[PDB]
């Protein structure tokens, strides 16, 4: 499935799309990607829209 990550920072706004077999693996993907950017904080997930958000 296609999932999305919304990055909601004070120094960064954006989105990534990634492929993964399910949402636990997409999580693991997106936290690595968020680490690249330096962005961490409150993680949430919208099953309707297969989208994670991370909000600093
Ligand atoms: Zn696939």
Query: Can you give the residue ranges of every domain in the chain?
Result: 1-56
Closest residue by Cα to residue 37 from 4, 18, 10, 19: 10
Question: Angle CA(17)–CA(47)–CA(35) in degrees, nearest 5?
Answer: 45
Residue appearing with tokens 């990607």:
33
> What spacing in Å lies between the alpha carbon of 20 and ligand 1's midpoint?
6
Experimental technique for the deposited model: X-ray
Burial of residue 1, with CB atoms counted within 10 A of its CB: 0-12 exposed, 13-18 middle, 19 or more buried: exposed
> What spacing in Å lies between the alpha carbon of 19 and ligand 1's midpoint?
6
Residue appearing with tokens 């990055």:
7
> What spacing in Å lies between the alpha carbon of 50 and ligand 1's midpoint?
14
For residue 55, what are its two tokens?
A: 């909000």
> What spacing in Å lies between the alpha carbon of 9 and ligand 1's midpoint?
29
> What spacing in Å lies between the alpha carbon of 24 and ligand 1's midpoint?
14
At 32, give phi and psi (nearest 5°): -75, -45
- Residues of the chain by 3-state class (helix, strand, coil), percent to 5: 25, 45, 30
Distance of CA 53 to the CA centre of its chain: 5
CATH number belonging to the domain at 1-56, selected among 3.90.1200.10, 3.10.20.10, 3.40.1280.10, 3.30.70.260: 3.10.20.10
CA distance 23 to 7: 17
């Amino acid at each position: 499935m296609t999932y999305k990550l919304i990055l909601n920072g004070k120094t960064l706004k954006g989105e990534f799309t990634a492929e993964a077999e399910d949402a636990a693996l997409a999580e693991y993907i997106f936290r690595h990607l968020a680490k690249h950017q330096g962005v961490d904080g409150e993680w949430t997930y919208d099953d309707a829209t297969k989208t994670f958000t991370v909000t600093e």
